[PDB]
DNA sequence: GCGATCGC
DNA sequence: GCGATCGC
């Protein structure tokens, strides 16, 4: 029940971490896709503004071996 | 341009 | 196959 705030295309947006499908890092930017009502939405935030919970999801993605 | 994806 | 995007 953690919300992530970001600005994609001028607009401000919030998505519950529960709808995030994938997370990854590019420098100090935490990037992700989420379930945008059936389709793939994209967003990113500074690691400085990443809710702890999103950072935990990132660490988990970075731990990945698949 | 990185990572990754969408929309061409 | 690359530009726009996001933050840097």
CATH number of the structural domain spanning residue A33: 2.40.50.40
Exposed/middle/buried for A63, CB within 10 Å: 0-12, 13-18, 19+? exposed
List the A29-36 sheet strands across, edge first. Answer: A20-26, A29-36, A39-46
Which residues constitute the domain of residue A20?
Answer: 1-66
Q: Is the CB of A33 under 7 A from strand C?
A: no
Into how many domains does chain A fold? 1
Whether the beta carbon of A44 falls within 7 A of nucleic chain C: the reply is: yes
| Nucleotide closest to residue A48 (CA–C1') | C7
Do the beta carbons of residue A23 and residue A31 sit within 8 Å? yes
Residue A38 phi/psi, 5° resolution? 95, -30
CA–C1' A32–B8 (A): 21
């Amino acid at each position: 029940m953690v919300k992530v705030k970001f600005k994609y295309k001028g607009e401000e947006k919030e998505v519950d971490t529960s709808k995030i499908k994938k997370v990854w890092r590019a420098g100090k930017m935490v990037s992700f896709t989420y379930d945008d009502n059936g389709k793939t939405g994209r967003g990113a935030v500074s690691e400085k503004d990443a809710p702890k919970e999103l950072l935990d999801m990132l660490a988990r993605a970075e731990r990945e071996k698949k």
